[PDB]
Design a protein around this ligand. Sequence first.
Ligand SMILES: Cc1cc2nc3c(=O)[nH]c(=O)nc-3n(C[C@H](O)[C@H](O)[C@H](O)COP(=O)(O)OP(=O)(O)OC[C@H]3O[C@@H](n4cnc5c(N)ncnc54)[C@H](O)[C@@H]3O)c2cc1C
Ligand SMILES: Cc1cc2nc3c(=O)[nH]c(=O)nc-3n(C[C@H](O)[C@H](O)[C@H](O)COP(=O)(O)OP(=O)(O)OC[C@H]3O[C@@H](n4cnc5c(N)ncnc54)[C@H](O)[C@@H]3O)c2cc1C
Ligand SMILES: NCCCCc1cn(-c2ccc(-c3nc(CCc4ccccc4)cs3)c(OCCC3CCNCC3)c2)nn1
Ligand SMILES: NCCCCc1cn(-c2ccc(-c3nc(CCc4ccccc4)cs3)c(OCCC3CCNCC3)c2)nn1
Lengths: 489, 489
Amino acid sequence: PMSRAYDLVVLGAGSGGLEAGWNAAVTHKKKVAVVDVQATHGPPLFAALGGTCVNVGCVPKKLMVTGAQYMDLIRESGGFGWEMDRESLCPNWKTLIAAKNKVVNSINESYKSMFADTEGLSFHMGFGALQDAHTVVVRKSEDPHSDVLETLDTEYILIATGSWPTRLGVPGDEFCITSNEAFYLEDAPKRMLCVGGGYIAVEFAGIFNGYKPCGGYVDLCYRGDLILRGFDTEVRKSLTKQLGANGIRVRTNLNPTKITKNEDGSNHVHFNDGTEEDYDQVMLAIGRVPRSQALQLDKAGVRTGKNGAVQVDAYSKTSVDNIYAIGDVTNRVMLTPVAINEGAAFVETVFGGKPRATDHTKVACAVFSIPPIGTCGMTEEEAAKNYETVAVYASSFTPLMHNISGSKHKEFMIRIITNESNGEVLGVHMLGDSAPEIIQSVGICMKMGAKISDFHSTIGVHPTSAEELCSMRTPAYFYESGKRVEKLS
Amino acid sequence: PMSRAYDLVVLGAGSGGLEAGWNAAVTHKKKVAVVDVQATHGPPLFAALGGTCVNVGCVPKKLMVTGAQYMDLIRESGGFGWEMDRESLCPNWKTLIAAKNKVVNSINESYKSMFADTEGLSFHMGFGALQDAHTVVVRKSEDPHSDVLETLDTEYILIATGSWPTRLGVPGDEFCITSNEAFYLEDAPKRMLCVGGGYIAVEFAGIFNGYKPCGGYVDLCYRGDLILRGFDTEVRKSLTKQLGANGIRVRTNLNPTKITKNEDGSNHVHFNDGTEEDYDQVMLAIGRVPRSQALQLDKAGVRTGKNGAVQVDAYSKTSVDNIYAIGDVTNRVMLTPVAINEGAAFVETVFGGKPRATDHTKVACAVFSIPPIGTCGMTEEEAAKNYETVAVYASSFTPLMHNISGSKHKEFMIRIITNESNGEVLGVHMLGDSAPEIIQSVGICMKMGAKISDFHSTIGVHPTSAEELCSMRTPAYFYESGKRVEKLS
Ligand SMILES: Cc1cc2nc3c(=O)[nH]c(=O)nc-3n(C[C@H](O)[C@H](O)[C@H](O)COP(=O)(O)OP(=O)(O)OC[C@H]3O[C@@H](n4cnc5c(N)ncnc54)[C@H](O)[C@@H]3O)c2cc1C
Ligand SMILES: Cc1cc2nc3c(=O)[nH]c(=O)nc-3n(C[C@H](O)[C@H](O)[C@H](O)COP(=O)(O)OP(=O)(O)OC[C@H]3O[C@@H](n4cnc5c(N)ncnc54)[C@H](O)[C@@H]3O)c2cc1C
Ligand SMILES: NCCCCc1cn(-c2ccc(-c3nc(CCc4ccccc4)cs3)c(OCCC3CCNCC3)c2)nn1
Ligand SMILES: NCCCCc1cn(-c2ccc(-c3nc(CCc4ccccc4)cs3)c(OCCC3CCNCC3)c2)nn1
């Protein structure tokens, strides 16, 4: 049947969008249109071809986290007998950004190669918006009276417009920055305030701390008692302690009430406790909400809810049968590899014939803090709620190399959460160098329903930090009927 | 029954010995005597309380590998904008050794605490030798006419005397060093020749290369075509290439015929090809044979064979019923965690009542080369022999951070070997930073009989090097009836 210009229009050329578009085009010879707002990373729109991850997320972030680590690694080299002037050690921030821009730019460039070279896959630059269930309009600007560039007549629509940082909404909010603006800063700031206690706040605290000029400092300021909500409690306390030792002042039960601009350019910040303080820059990392607010979803009749989240079934389908939505715009787990899996499972479902729903349980993630976190599965707090009897295995050690490096604060931590019944591993929570690498392969065991038996029965790899997974036999303590107990009934 | 001084005498206070001794003593309240030749690391005997691993193996080696990495890491920091004088960058070897000695010393010290503090576990310093099946004699020196220090009357004997470096046996052999002597060298050598192509040769090449003074160099000289026999062929070629780029000259089908001492202290080395060359030091790493040659095993009638290996059944028992032998002295897999498992499984078998034999299949190990290797299970060469149909998955990439670091030679490599029949994963072979950490948890999956299905069905952790395990769906090529084929019948 030769009806409609495109089989599939994809709003958002990000992690979810491109996977879907590319699969649909090459493996199922479908005609696929992919809409995004710019082809290259940067202000004023930030996101681009490749999406948030490539342009202003996972990729550039980890490049910069890697950069800031050299501060620690250079300190540490001295114990191993690397004499070299430590007074001459101020990192050049401009050289880092240049390098990071070069790398992101080459990815954007390799995505233009993809489109020109791949048959039946076209890229449409502007602002997508629905008109009906079968029509997506592309505009110059997001202002819905902007000149219309293209009207894409399509059989299926896939909404993959991702998410956008949330603002603080107080007198002074417009003088603060976010992840987006942080990546283009001309100079590393001397006096830096990271507002928030989520993984972005923490990762960027670590970056700024590494790239701070001589005499500078980083405060991390959080609404609540303990940073990294929904992470292992003892891992969060240990990281709080290690950010401290690395020179990051963590402040809790603290919220800016007001920001005003000083004469030199810096920002005055009033807080809850009465305290006033001056910062060269103030970065809000207080959450990310879906971008559905300009897609005019009301017009097509696709179902919205909790903060513009696209209401979606297991197979990613909206209220309208031909319109699907994946990634951060759905407001489930906001990770790149999830969106990629949802997009892959969308093409298999609709165009493959072979239906599949993404599996959201025990998906491993990481925090690229200094030091880093690797986690997969559930905290002991939620295990003790959903499970009769729960064993908590726990082990903390300092790798011998830190007796030499001077970094004696760098406790490596592993906690495993069990179902007593059958030994099943419900959660693994690691803090320390290499954790994100180790957890990936933990995530495979946990997928295969690994019991604690399966860990301690594995011959170890010496000397390693991971070999301590296979040395955890005796539980530290338990939970029967969701209350902590010294020992088991 | 109150008969015999000790339930158990353990010749060798190493990885195997101490595990066995300690388990027997605390968990089974047995009376345990542990014999070793000195309580502290160092010349002229090197090994000590804690064994080869703690004193002159895994532990000090990795400390020094960690040290040498700083050479690369400091180079790499520049791309991320770490300005600092690179002309002022010669590592102080004396500071490294001091530090490494401090660390090993504290372990030796913590093992004396263990003995004094632990009831029914005594330490007997000298040279063990059998007299009969129930009597171990301890002598001042290994000369079997040395003054006798103790006669230990015992019900069970456990031989855990480990192994010892092999010599080259040519005119000049006595002027060369080994792993043992390398660890106490007063100065880092300017012109270093590592003879051998085993993991020790390669790891030490990397150390010397990091700690070489200004203008110095390291040659790695190997008998055969390709270093690291019994490793993935494409991993060995890739590492050969990366040692090259890191400044190590690899030489193959090359063997020293003769070494003589020069006037200044250096060594003249004649080779096969006719070539003569001068080296400040020459380190032989050409294999390790059991220490059974002074235990006078002939007297007790315990069965020897291939190079003094103690002939042993699955449960570690010698020809004599009450005498067992574990670790490198058996000449199976010569790794610390194996010996520890054999010792643990000896105490459970004999003293526990609950018999168990160590499982030697798909045990993950690592090479602390620069860059490092993580491997578990079988090469495609032996898979293609023992299996009808074999799939080989393979992927090589350069992490984006090396576009910035300048280290563009640092290809990260993963190869998986499958049984086509059922998808089972028979082998995983990784080269690159973090590999030894990643392989540990691969070793758990492979223990649980993971299929390739189980890998690619796992949501990935972004951005990571390990997430490329879960992105390998299409085999690179196969093997039916042990011959390589482009594609499958
Ligand atoms: C600072 C930061 C760090 C992160 N680090 C990690 C990490 O380490 N690991 C990880 O797994 N995840 C990480 N994430 C999360 C990751 O970026 C997202 O989960 C992922 O990008 C979501 O993919 P998506 O397909 O939902 O949308 P995106 O990848 O965000 O793609 C959405 C695209 O839609 C476009 N778009 C928006 N509106 C329109 C419109 N009207 N018309 C057309 N196009 C439009 C945007 O320009 C954008 O390019 C990070 C996120 C941030 C912000
Ligand atoms: C340089 C090097 C690096 C290594 N790196 C690693 C690594 O990274 N990972 C890994 O898993 N393995 C590694 N190994 C291997 C590891 O050291 C051995 O596999 C392990 O130590 C074997 O333990 P064992 O119990 O068999 O004996 P050992 O640990 O060697 O203990 C034997 C002990 O017996 C004592 N002894 C000898 N003869 C007598 C006697 N007559 N009387 C009394 N005592 C005696 C010795 O003094 C010694 O202390 C390495 C080995 C070397 C040499
Ligand atoms: N007519 C059919 C045959 C067409 C055949 C065809 C391929 N390309 C083509 C073009 C590009 C890419 C990519 N590049 C990156 C960025 C990688 C990068 C960039 C710079 C430096 C280092 C690394 C991610 S993806 C690509 O990968 C396919 C996978 C998918 C994964 C899901 N997302 C989209 C890409 C295929 N050009 N022609
Ligand atoms: N009467 C019964 C109760 C006795 C109770 C009792 C314990 N100790 C005791 C004493 C020592 C150690 C060790 N230390 C290291 C070295 C660790 C180290 C050293 C320096 C710096 C950093 C790290 C390895 S092991 C130990 O660990 C038990 C496990 C075993 C594992 C198998 N090998 C032997 C030790 C127990 N002292 N008193």
